[PDB]
Design a protein around this ligand. Structure first.
Ligand code: CLR
Ligand code: CLR
Ligand code: CLR
Ligand code: CLR
Ligand code: CLR
Length: 1422
């Protein structure tokens, strides 16, 4: 190279000076060879890759011509430079070839740049990574030439000016070209801008931000979320996975058959063989990032060394700061891309498993299907697949730990020595302790869950039946009855809370402990050891680096253990056998549409044949009926026709299609029209005919929505009579060839059955040509059939026509969130794991004022002290660092053989004391925090319960029960579980950040300036993220439940699905429903990565400046002062991301307190007890009177009852009777003050009901409930919750009620338990018991109602007479509809539309014609 060039390649004199620079020999050689090599070496492929995939050229845009003209300018500039150089010196001038090759080289390269750019015009991504990286390499290499050239000229030499000006122009044009090579230049494809995006946009995610702007202004819906790429569409992933699954299983089955004469491991392989490439790429990226994790500490040590002494050069510090900035930037850019790749792979695996499970479900054999449960398979897809997604989101950790740890350990020893082991051991002993406490926490949480479940069950009953409680005034008892359970749960909650505090304490103080032990052991083990700043601060940095893997490796091992059993379970279902179909021949026999050649089928595998030796044939257009006894096997025969049984001997010939009407009707979710259509083009000449013939017209008219009324699990639940007619209508509208009806006229009555038979299926009906096979139990329609068969014991006994069988004279005669892994937020490694586990376990079972309110519930007195403790801990932290910074500074004064013992002891005793103080203050803060919450949950729930239990009926009527009960279950769980964890983590993160900034600003009072700008950027970048992520969190939940709903529906109705041959439609529906959720998950997976690049950039900028500010003031700075500032600021990048993410969860979770508060402040009704007390034995006589009583249910609604003036005498029986909508039932709800008194008043015993207190009036009144309701518990609780009576008087009551026979001979006496609404008891005694309930009170005024409607005749009679025999010295008012029953009333009151009309004796009312007489004439009682 010496003869090629003219100057020396490298000499110490070039450097080793205040001013130092590489010569124009090293810079004009290697620095102009690296950039060219990258372009030349890796061009061919980047042309082969374009050559094979050449498509249509894209329209030309201004950017293209600009990029082409700038390169042309470069070309002409290089050409003119070469010409000038050649012309300058030709004769007697041995010009070095550095002036010949370099010019020519560039001229050669620019040509390739022009060509490669044109070729890109024929691909999707125009600006790829190749050129974008080339330009950066060129600029970085050419900055050095620019650095020296300028100096040479500035120094004062004028020898070379053309070259400098030429080089300067080129360097600029290069800058401009790089700037132009970043614009997206989009084709504006509505699918997604991810495919069309330059390198820089696709590496800083500056294309998602459009959505960030769209969601900030207005709420965003499913329309404006970009669709997923084709490579991820469900249809594509399945095929790819299916190929390898099919290829593997067969080999696994062969291996299992060859040996041991149910596969063992195939799923895991099928996944690796399908997705190895993404694994390889992610592994490479993770390996590259793993390197930067240990690069920083070396630059930090270099900074400490440079700042320690004084006789150095500034360039060293400036270069080190620039290198630190660049390393941080590169590490962040690589890490984000690795995260994106891994999470995308996880989503792909989850979709490819869920869709494949769904596709198998509808082709599995009957045996395996009957082995499983309907909910079990849904839980299988909803739980197993999700578990596999997690173990594929964090697998690379396994290898990225055993390596990281090793590397870290190596650095430590080279830095300190064997003392390091002391720290590691203390950092290893923590994990064992952590386990003993997790097991205890789980043990407590199990009983917590059990007691919580017991509490909610009583809540549901009282909320649903709030009417009966109000009538009998039983509210006070349930208060304490539920408060007992509340306290019993609260004690366990407090125990669990204080246990969780010990765990956070050990994970919180471990950094200081390891530091005190390591430093003390190192300095005290040998007198020769001297502590210096570089070693100490670098050791701290490596300890902080190593602290994570040793704490995530335990978690990863536990997760893989769960995924093992999850995989094992799925492989049984996805590898199950298929039903056999080599028994039904779909041939066009034509001679017959059915043939049985001595068939014999069995339900089980090899058990007894349910159908044995059956042989029959029926021609087309023949209606034949199959009859027999119970358990004969008809439905088994029709299922064998469908082919749902295992063949044993014989074959069945079927011509044409088939239609099925199952005995147990199956109804989907949706409108009635959708169910009737069942995937068919809508018509008008047939739809109307079907609905009318099936007599589904009158009922449809009565439905609230008519034809478009939502039916199914989440809608009107129809009865057997209707659901059967809907199924029959669907079957008859689909219009197939062969109909197999299984008892379709059982739920309907005689009229509807006759109409359907004469209009739909029969001699003259819709299906008059198609063959019909009907199974029946009624002999009413037998004469109108063609042939009948009598099945017996699974075989045919007699087959013949109606007349023939009757003539045969035999048997017939008698017969007729937002978190994906624990690597993204490593500090909160535990809480995240617990939340996942809790959610998985819970799946199986199934204006700043609110912050002030929650703090007031907690208690501000304790809040002040807790904040004081946390703040004091931060001060003790900064204090310890300054003591070390002083301790490390101490070394320069002394030497190896001058260190005294007193200094050695003093420099460590104080360090130990400060560590102890830090530990104590944290422990105290955590100790109080736990209690400060258990009290909050108690006051919030108790306060809420008393208020909600006292609300008037309006509120209970307007709001659905579901909303009210959810607050008592979900919110209370949220307010006492995750809430405290986040509320206690956020303050720790904020105080850590604040403490770090005080330290840097203290050392450099100048730093205070940068704080303001960063804050404005931080709080700005912050609002944006939350303003969008919150909305996407909701969309995801709304677009998930559908999938599991669909799977449950198809699994339940498989035979009907497979009888109609309608599987492709359902597969397509499932594929669409999966692609809707797969589109929404990615939209938040990308957003999290957007925030990171922005915040990691901010966090790296705030440390770059600090470093530079300590090089311009280094004259006044020591080596240690440049240690505590950088050693801490090095970990401020990720803490910002953690704070934003954690403050985006606390904000979403505070919604719980808000809801609870609204119901705690619901309007209340009149006070229960007032000072006005009634005279003793107030209801002495039954004297009621109404003075123009007028009332309205709600203020916005009009008066329902008006102008009421009647008199009620003592010991008088009154019958209230009227028309519909006359307010008869309102009269009762007016005597118990359930409503108010818009006009008039009610006076009883001379005392207006208003004056008497609420709970003081109801006690002395009795009413028989309209719908007898029985609460859970024991028989004593239903009869007397208040345990006021004794058993003796109770035992008399059942004797009067004719129920002592049942209760005396029961399993127990009065202590027998009852299930829900008395489910254990039968209907007969449920209505009877409520009679006895009211009997015990033996009040004076009894308000009866029409509640004997479902009471059986004999029982009814008993009830009627019982009333007369027992209630004689009392006043009885009865609202009834049995006009006949109303005959003995002393006065009969008549209501028309809310006005008293006739008041007289029934004999007088009938003697004189009138509205009552007209009603009796219509009724015909007399
Ligand atoms: C790794 C690089 C890129 C960044 C780190 C800073 C580099 C440029 C610095 C740090 C320490 C420096 C060395 C320190 C001491 C000497 C001895 C002297 O007689 C010749 C220069 C030499 C050998 C220096 C060369 C430049 C150097 C290696
Ligand atoms: C666009 C970027 C990449 C250019 C980077 C190089 C710049 C920042 C550097 C490289 C060489 C530097 C020059 C080197 C020497 C001198 C002479 C001195 O008496 C004043 C400063 C001055 C004039 C420096 C100014 C800044 C400078 C021009
Ligand atoms: C590594 C890449 C990314 C950045 C390169 C930055 C280079 C061009 C910069 C960084 C620090 C700079 C040096 C800082 C200080 C001095 C002392 C001055 O009297 C002469 C110039 C000199 C010696 C500079 C030369 C150019 C320099 C080395
Ligand atoms: C070049 C880009 C990429 C990085 C930025 C580097 C900056 C911080 C560097 C590059 C050139 C440097 C300057 C080069 C020369 C001098 C003259 C000297 O008497 C004081 C320092 C001073 C003024 C330096 C300050 C720091 C400096 C401006
Ligand atoms: C140990 C516990 C009791 C500490 C309590 C700390 C209090 C003061 C903290 C915890 C949660 C915090 C809130 C969390 C989120 C936000 C949203 C942000 O846009 C404005 C500040 C605001 C509204 C915070 C205000 C201060 C806050 C209420």
């Amino acid at each position: 190279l010496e003869k090629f060039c003219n100057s020396t390649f490298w000499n110490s004199s070039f450097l080793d000076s205040p001013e130092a620079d590489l010569p124009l020999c090293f810079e004009q050689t290697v620095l102009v060879w690296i950039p060219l090599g990258y372009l030349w070496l890796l061009a061919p492929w980047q042309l082969l890759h374009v050559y094979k995939s050449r498509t249509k050229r894209s329209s030309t845009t201004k950017l293209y011509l600009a990029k082409q003209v700038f390169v042309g300018f470069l070309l002409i500039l290089a050409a003119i430079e070469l010409a000038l150089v050649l012309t300058e010196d030709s004769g007697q001038a041995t010009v070095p070839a550095v002036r010949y090759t370099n010019p020519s080289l560039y001229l050669g390269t620019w040509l390739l740049v022009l060509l490669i750019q044109y070729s890109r015009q024929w691909c999707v991504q125009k600006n790829s990574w190749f050129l974008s990286l080339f330009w950066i390499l060129s600029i970085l290499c050419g900055t050095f030439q620019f650095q020296t050239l300028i100096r040479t000229l500035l120094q004062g030499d004028n020898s070379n000016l053309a070259y400098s000006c030429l080089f300067f122009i080129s360097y600029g044009f290069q800058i401009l070209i790089l700037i132009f090579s970043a614009f997206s230049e989009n084709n504006e494809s509505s699918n997604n801008p991810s495919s069309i995006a330059s390198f820089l946009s696709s590496i800083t995610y500056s294309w998602y931000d459009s959505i960030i702007l769209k969601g900030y202004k207005r709420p965003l819906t499913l329309e404006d979320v970009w669709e997923v790429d084709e490579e991820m569409k469900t249809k594509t992933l399945v095929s790819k996975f299916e190929t390898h699954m099919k290829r593997e299983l067969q080999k696994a089955r062969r291996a299992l058959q060859r040996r041991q004469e149910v596969p063992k491991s195939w799923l895991m392989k099928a996944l690796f063989k399908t997705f190895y490439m993404v694994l390889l790429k992610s592994f490479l990226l993770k390996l590259v990032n793993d390197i930067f994790t240990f690069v920083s500490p070396q630059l930090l040590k270099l900074l400490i060394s440079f700042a320690s002494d004084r006789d150095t050069y500034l360039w060293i510090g400036y270069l080190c700061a620039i290198l630190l900035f660049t390393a941080a930037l590169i590490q962040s850019f690589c890490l984000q891309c690795y995260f994106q790749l891994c999470f995308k792979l996880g989503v792909k695996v989850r979709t490819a498993i869920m869709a494949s499970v769904y596709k198998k479900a509808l082709t599995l054999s009957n045996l395996a299907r009957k082995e499983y449960t309907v909910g079990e398979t849904v839980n299988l897809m909803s739980v197993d697949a999700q578990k596999l997604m997690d173990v594929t989101n964090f697998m690379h950790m396994l290898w990225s730990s055993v390596l990281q740890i090793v590397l870290s350990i190596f650095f430590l020893w080279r830095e300190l020595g064997p003392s390091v082991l002391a720290g590691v051991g203390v950092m290893v002993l923590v994990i064992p302790i952590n386990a003993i406490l997790s097991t205890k926490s789980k043990t407590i949480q199990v009983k917590n869950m059990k007691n919580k479940d017991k509490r909610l069950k009583i809540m549901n009953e009282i909320l649903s039946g709030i009417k009966i409680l109000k009538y009998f005034a039983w509210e006070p008892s349930f208060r304490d009855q539920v408060q007992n359970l509340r306290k019993k749960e609260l004690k366990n909650l407090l125990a669990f809370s204080q246990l969780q505090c010990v765990v956070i304490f050990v994970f919180q103080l471990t950094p200081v402990l390891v530091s005190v032990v390591t430093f003390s052991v190192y300095v005290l083990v040998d007198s020769n050891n001297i502590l210096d700043a570089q070693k100490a601060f670098t050791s701290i940095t490596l300890f902080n680096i190593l602290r994570f893997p040793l704490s995530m490796l335990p978690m990863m091992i536990s997760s893989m253990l769960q995924a093992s059993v999850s995989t094992e379970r799925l492989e049984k279902y996805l590898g199950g056998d298929d039903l056999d179909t080599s028994a039904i021949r779909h041939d066009c026999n034509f001679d017959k549409a059915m043939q049985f050649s001595e068939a014999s089928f069995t339900w089980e595998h090899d058990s007894e044949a349910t159908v044995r030796d059956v042989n029959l044939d029926i021609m087309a257009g023949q209606l034949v009926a199959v009859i027999g006894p119970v358990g004969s096997g008809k439905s088994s025969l029709i299922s064998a026709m469908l082919g749902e049984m295992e063949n044993v001997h014989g074959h069945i010939t079927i011509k044409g299609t088939t239609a099925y009407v199952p005995q147990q009707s199956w109804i989907q979710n949706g409108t009635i029209k959708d169910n009737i259509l069942f995937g068919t083009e809508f018509n008008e000449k047939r739809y109307q005919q079907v609905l009318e013939a099936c007599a589904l017209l009158p009922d449809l008219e009565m439905l609230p929505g008519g034809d478009l009324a939502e039916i199914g699990e989440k809608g009107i639940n129809l009865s057997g009579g209707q659901k059967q007619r809907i199924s029959l209508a669907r079957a008859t509208y689909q219009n197939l060839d062969i109909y197999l009806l299984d008892d379709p006229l059982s739920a309907v009555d005689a009229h509807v059955g006759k109409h359907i038979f004469n209009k739909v299926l029969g001699p003259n009906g819709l299906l008059k040509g198609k063959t019909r096979l009907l199974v029946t139990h009624s002999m009413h329609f037998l004469p109108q059939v063609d042939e009948i068969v009598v099945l017996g014991n699974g075989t045919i006994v007699e087959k013949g026509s109606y007349s023939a069988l009757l003539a045969k004279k035999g048997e017939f005669a008698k017969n007729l969130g937002l978190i994906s892994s624990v690597e993204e937020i490593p500090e909160d490694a535990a809480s995240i794991t617990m939340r996942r586990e809790n959610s998985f376990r819970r799946t199986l079972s199934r204006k700043f004022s609110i912050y002030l309110e929650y703090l007031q519930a907690i208690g501000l007195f304790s809040i002040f002290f807790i904040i004081l403790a946390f703040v004091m801990n931060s001060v003790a932290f900064i204090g310890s660092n300054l003591w070390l910074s002083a301790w490390t500074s101490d070394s320069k004064i002394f030497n190896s053989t001058d260190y005294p013992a007193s200094q050695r002891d003093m420099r460590v005793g104080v360090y130990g004391a400060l560590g102890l103080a830090q530990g104590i203050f944290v422990f105290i803060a955590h100790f109080w925090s736990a209690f400060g919450f258990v009290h909050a949950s108690n006051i919030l729930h108790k306060q809420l319960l008393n208020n909600i239990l006292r609300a008037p009926m309006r509120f209970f009527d307007t709001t659905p029960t579901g909303r009210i009960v959810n607050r008592f279950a979900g919110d209370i769980s949220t307010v006492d579980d995750t809430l405290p964890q986040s509320l206690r983590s956020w303050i720790t993160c904020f105080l850590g950040i604040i403490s770090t900034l005080v330290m840097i600003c203290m050392a450099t009072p100048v730093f205070t300036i940068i704080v303001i700008p960063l804050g404005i950027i931080y709080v700005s970048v912050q609002m944006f993220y939350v303003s969008t992520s919150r909305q996407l969190r909701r969309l995801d939940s709304v677009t998930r439940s559908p999938i599991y709903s669909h799977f449950s529906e198809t699994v339940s109705g498989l035979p009907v699905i497979r009888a109609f041959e309608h599987q492709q439609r359902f597969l397509k529906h499932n594929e669409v429903r999966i692609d809707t959720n797969q589109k929404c998950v990615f939209s938040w997976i990308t957003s999290n990565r957007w925030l990171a690049i922005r915040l990691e950039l901010v966090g790296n900028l705030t440390v770059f400046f600090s470093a530079l500010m300590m090089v311009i003031y280094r004259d006044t700075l020591s080596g240690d002062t440049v240690g505590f500032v950088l050693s801490n600021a090095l970990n401020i990048t990720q803490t910002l991301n953690w704070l934003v993410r954690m403050t985006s969860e606390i904000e979403t979770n505070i919604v719980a307190v808000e809801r609870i508060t609204e119901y705690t402040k619901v309007e209340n009704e009149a006070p229960w007890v007032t000072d006005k007390r009634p005279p003793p034995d107030w209801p002495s006589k039954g004297k009621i009177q109404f003075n123009n009583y007028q009332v309205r249910y709600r203020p916005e609604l009009d008066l329902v009852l008006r102008g009421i003036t009647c008199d009620i005498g003592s010991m008088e029986k009154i019958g209230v009777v009227g028309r519909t909508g006359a307010g008869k039932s309102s009269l009762t709800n007016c005597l118990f003050r359930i409503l108010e008194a818009a006009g008039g008043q009610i006076i009883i015993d001379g005392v207006d009901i208003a004056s008497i207190g609420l709970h003081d009036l109801r006690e002395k009144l009795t009413i028989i409930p309209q719908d007898p309701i029985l609460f859970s518990g024991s028989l004593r609780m239903n009869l007397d919750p208040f345990n006021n009576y004794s058993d003796e008087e109770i035992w008399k009551a059942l004797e009067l009620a004719h129920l002592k026979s049942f209760v005396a001979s029961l399993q127990l006496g009065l202590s027998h338990e009852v299930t829900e609404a008395g489910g254990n008891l039968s209907i007969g005694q449920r209505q009877l018991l409520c009679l006895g309930r009211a009997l015990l009170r033996k009040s004076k005024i009894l308000v009866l109602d029409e509640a004997t409607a479902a009471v059986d005749l004999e029982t009814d009679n008993l009830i009627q007479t019982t009333i007369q025999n027992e209630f004689a010295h009392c006043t009885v008012i009865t609202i009834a509809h049995r006009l006949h029953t109303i005959m003995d009333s002393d006065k009969v009151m008549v209501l028309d539309n809310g006005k008293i009309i006739e008041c007289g004796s029934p004999e007088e009312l009938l003697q004189i014609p009138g509205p009552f007489y007209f009603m009796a004439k219509e009724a015909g009682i007399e």
